[PDB]
Amino acid sequence: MDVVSLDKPFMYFEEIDNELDYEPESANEVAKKLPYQGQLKLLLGELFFLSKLQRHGILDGATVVYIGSAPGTHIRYLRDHFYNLGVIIKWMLIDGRHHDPILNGLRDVTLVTRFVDEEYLRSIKKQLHPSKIILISDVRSPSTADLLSNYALQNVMISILNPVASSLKWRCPFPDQWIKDFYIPHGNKMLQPFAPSYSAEMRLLSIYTGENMRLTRVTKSDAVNYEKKMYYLNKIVRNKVVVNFDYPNQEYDYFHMYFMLRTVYCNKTFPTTKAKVLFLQQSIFRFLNIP
Amino acid sequence: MDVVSLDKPFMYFEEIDNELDYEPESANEVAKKLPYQGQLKLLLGELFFLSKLQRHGILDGATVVYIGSAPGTHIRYLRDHFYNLGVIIKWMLIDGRHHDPILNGLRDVTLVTRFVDEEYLRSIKKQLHPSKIILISDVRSPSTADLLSNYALQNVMISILNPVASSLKWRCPFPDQWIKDFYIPHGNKMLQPFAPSYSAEMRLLSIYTGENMRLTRVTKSDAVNYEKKMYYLNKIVRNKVVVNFDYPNQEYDYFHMYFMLRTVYCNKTFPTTKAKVLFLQQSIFRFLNIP
Ligand SMILES: Nc1ncnc2c1ncn2[C@@H]1O[C@H](CSCC[C@H](N)C(=O)O)[C@@H](O)[C@H]1O
Ligand SMILES: Nc1ncnc2c1ncn2[C@@H]1O[C@H](CSCC[C@H](N)C(=O)O)[C@@H](O)[C@H]1O
Numbered sequence A, B: 001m002d003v004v005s006l007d008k009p010f011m012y013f014e015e016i017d018n019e020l021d022y023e024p025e026s027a028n029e030v031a032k033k034l035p036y037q038g039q040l041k042l043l044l045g046e047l048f049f050l051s052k053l054q055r056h057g058i059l060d061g062a063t064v065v066y067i068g069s070a071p072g073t074h075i076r077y078l079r080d081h082f083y084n085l086g087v088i089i090k091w092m093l094i095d096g097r098h099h100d101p102i103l104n105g106l107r108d109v110t111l112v113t114r115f116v117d118e119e120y121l122r123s124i125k126k127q128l129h130p131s132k133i134i135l136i137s138d139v140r141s142p143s144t145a146d147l148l149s150n151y152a153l154q155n156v157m158i159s160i161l162n163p164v165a166s167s168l169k170w171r172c173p174f175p176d177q178w179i180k181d182f183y184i185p186h187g188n189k190m191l192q193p194f195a196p197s198y199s200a201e202m203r204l205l206s207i208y209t210g211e212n213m214r215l216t217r218v219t220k221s222d223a224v225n226y227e228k229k230m231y232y233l234n235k236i237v238r239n240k241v242v243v244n245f246d247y248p249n250q251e252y253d254y255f256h257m258y259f260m261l262r263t264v265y266c267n268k269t270f271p272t273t274k275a276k277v278l279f280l281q282q283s284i285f286r287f288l289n290i291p
Helices: A024-028 A037-055 A073-084 A118-128 A144-161 A220-235 A252-261 A273-288 B024-028 B037-055 B073-084 B118-128 B144-161 B220-235 B252-261 B273-288
Strands: A063-067 A090-095 A109-113 A133-137 A165-170 A182-185 A188-190 A202-207 A212-218 B063-067 B090-095 B109-113 B133-137 B165-170 B182-185 B188-190 B202-207 B212-218
Touching: A024 A220, A037 A073, A037 A133, A037 A165, A037 A188, A037 A202, A037 A252, A037 A273, A063 A118, A073 A090, A073 A273, A090 A118, A118 A144, A133 A144, A144 A165, A144 A182, A144 A212, A165 A182, A182 A202, A252 A273, B024 B220, B037 B073, B037 B133, B037 B165, B037 B188, B037 B202, B037 B252, B037 B273, B063 B118, B073 B090, B073 B273, B090 B118, B118 B144, B133 B144, B144 B165, B144 B182, B144 B212, B165 B182, B182 B202, B252 B273
Parallel strands: A063 A090, A063 A133, A090 A109, A133 A165, B063 B090, B063 B133, B090 B109, B133 B165
Antiparallel strands: A165 A202, A182 A212, A188 A202, A212 B212, B165 B202, B182 B212, B188 B202
């Protein structure tokens, strides 16, 4: 058994302190070990991001514009959690695909069946005006060209919407499939527990101050670094059993999930952080129907 | 006579401490009072910008890519000044129009007859590689749409070229002809002596650190502010005779020019800043054929 004692898990890309030459045969290995693992991955990252904004006083009163939200099954959980906490938020879920019917019938959540383009962003900006916007993007086109086009749309989302904060889907293209350098918004590169086994995807979290928008250039050399750091994390780290972690499940992803969940606010009061987390996790798995 | 005693002139947009409701009848007033006033305006701003980079140690060894450089008569002066100072610079002047023949026959200056598009920028970036680039843009399409398109090109110039510094032509569109908000690179808004009588144009000066690119949003409310601050500067300020300025010409623009010229480096040693400036100015007027 692959055991280890760990202090804390890697929360951000910048924390990864080692690399491994990516082995292409990894792409054939089992990508998921849990049912609805994708909704779980998304729920944890978004609970983490949104709890932070609450902590900074920027959540209440905002309109969350989630683009690429369908099916969005897990979003029902997110909405319920903050709604029950007394936070006032309007949700605007936009996707050309249809949403899970559990999202219907909520006065605070608007479902839009539209694929967004720059022009549409302008009209909804005019319509949301003057509410404060929090953007969440999870749009999916694959190719490096598909990715670049996605990233380009995400930047137009921020420029037209001009949100107070954003969570963007972010996976650096493969260095060996490089087309050209580009810019992404500056922000924290949040690592994702329960991402597929060999996924190099993270979520870019940003809070906008003043009227400045800071971007950062990404080059092929950066692409090689992302690939190796993420491969090391996936191959080595995520395969660990954290024995000094006294919790029902000691696998790395549960240790990692624990650290994101401990930052979440609950109405119920708990004697220990471990009790709150077990509760949130049980609650989350029950909601998603994960045994 | 319109007299006043002034400490220093307004060097940057941010220094303008007053505003005046723009009077449209100003557009009919004489725009220029000196021959080749346009080449003079350009020469002073660029001597100012380039002298700063020299001061920061980033000029020597760089390739200056000037787009929208034709005719470029004044550029001959700029090139000679730094060349004579011993600074090693390669000039790449690109415009679809032809350059003044005084620019021909210089091994250090390459004249390109091409209107640049994004694709062309990519090929010259590949070709300049790996030299450090200093971008200077003075492209001209008029309409708010023309301007926006120009600004959009200037940002692509910085993103593909990835320069160590830049000087960009910058005039905010009229609030009453607003089309949409946009972003410009962050930098100092250098005011221009000898600009036309009622011009609201300035030059955006930037030095790039790290691999970050910081932009700033410009809105219609910003447009109204630019209009009134610039109108106050043009109508009131630039019409002053600075009597406490002991110089052959006391008009405001000469007082302003003096402060930019005092930052310029010369081989010849002078006993006073006033002697260096009189010398640089005489030299500049003689070169441009201004009486
Ligand atoms: N222009 C666009 N606007 C809106 N949605 C888009 C888009 N292009 C792609 N997408 C959407 O991006 C999605 C990626 S899958 C997203 C899953 C969703 N976030 C969840 O919580 O279940 C697809 O549903 C797709 O239709
Ligand atoms: N895509 C483009 N690439 C290069 N030059 C361009 C351009 N579009 C417009 N311009 C140029 O922008 C110029 C504006 S006038 C510039 C004057 C010049 N800076 C001087 O020192 O004399 C015109 O010469 C025009 O041909």
